[model samples]
Target: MKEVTIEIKNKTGLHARPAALFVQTASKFSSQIWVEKDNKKVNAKSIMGIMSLGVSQGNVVKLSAEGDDEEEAIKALVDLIESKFGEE
Candidate 1:
């Protein structure tokens, strides 16, 4: 399994379009991926699950994946979030 801790920098955090993009990226991976925050974890490929966490700006999320592509999955996810989901 691979794991990375990243802080969401976008003001609105993962929601709406950002969440959709995140889900899209996550779905491309064959690994089982999840986002963890405040001890709670949600499937990274599920928009509803991610939205339920209300992950806002400044919150740190732990992204983890387990599979043959776990490392690649984690890297892509962390990179996306680090890029602020392409938002300001």
Candidate 2:
């Protein structure tokens, strides 16, 4: 398994746009992926699951993946989160 812990820098957090991108990205990987925050975890490919977490700027979230594409999955998801979900 591969994992990355990232701090949310996007002002709007992982809301609709970012959450959609997150789910989209997670779906591309064959690995099992999940997002964790405050000891709660949810499926990375589920938009509703992600949004329900109410992740906001300054929050730290951990992403974990297991299976064939685990490393790539962690890197990609971490990159997206670090990019502020494309917010400028």
Clashing pairs in 1: none
Each candidate structure's TM-score, on Cα atoms with residue i matched to residue i, is 0.94, 0.94
Which ranges of candidate 2 are over 4 A from the true structure? none
Candidate lDDT scores, in order, read 0.90, 0.90
Sequence-dependent TM-score of model 2:
0.94
Q: How good is model 1 by TM-score?
A: 0.94
Candidate 2: tens digits of C-alpha lDDT, residues 1-88 = 9988889888877786888898999999999999999989999999888988889888999889999999999999998988888888
Task: Find the 10 residues in a row with the least total lDDT in model 2.
Answer: 8-17
Question: Among these predicted structures, which one has the highest lDDT?
Answer: 1
lDDT at 26, model 1: 97
lDDT of 2: 0.90
Off by over 4 Å in 1: none
Each prediction's total of clashing residue pairs, residues at least 3 apart in sequence or on different chains, is 0, 0
